[PDB]
Amino acid sequence: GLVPRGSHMTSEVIEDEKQFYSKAKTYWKQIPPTVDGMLGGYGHISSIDINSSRKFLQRFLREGPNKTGTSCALDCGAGIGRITKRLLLPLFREVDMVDITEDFLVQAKTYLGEEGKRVRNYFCCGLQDFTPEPDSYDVIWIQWVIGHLTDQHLAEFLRRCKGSLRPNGIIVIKDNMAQEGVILDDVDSSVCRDLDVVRRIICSAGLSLLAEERQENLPDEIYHVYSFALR
């Protein structure tokens, strides 16, 4: 028969792309603009996430003969700025945020406080329609949002990101990874892809892998989380 043991691409699980995006936008409009909202009930592990991210990122900023710069970072799917506040603003002179949900960007101005004055651009845009400026960012940080893009949109978005990197710049993807295949969450309208699927998409964007690390110390019941450094 034609029905495979499992799916391995978004075209196998997404019935209608327009509805996939519109349902996701509606979902996020209804979420409280809080850390626990950003983390789907896992606000209590925000520090575990941030501290591991900092260690992951610092190697690129502090070590080697070709250090990644600290002039400008872009936080993708930034929400209210959980990551911008504790990871990026303390490390970069300037940060831009991009998110589809304007109310989160509005909340960010309050959430980020005084240090938020160093957030330059608040881009309200879906990643699928967003073009980061060429030769502009030292670090493009993409976390807990890749499941909201189709495979074609994710591949193209990553390709646009590559052109946006400054010399020695990197893209970091940190996100849920499925044990096997591609799994649809029809409640928030997103997918979770396995490591192989994500590797294929990274390759198709013309990106090279610099580091790949599984997040330790997370809740037992959740999908595994991986960080990929790319350029």
């Binding site: 950003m38 983390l39 789907g40 009930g41 896992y42 592990i45 807990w144 849920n176 499925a178 044990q179 969450d185 979770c192 997370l218 809740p219 019941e221 959740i222 999908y223 989380v225």
Partner: peptide, 8 residues
Amino acid sequence: XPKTSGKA
């Protein structure tokens, strides 16, 4: 967000 992987 981080989320349950569901049933084993």
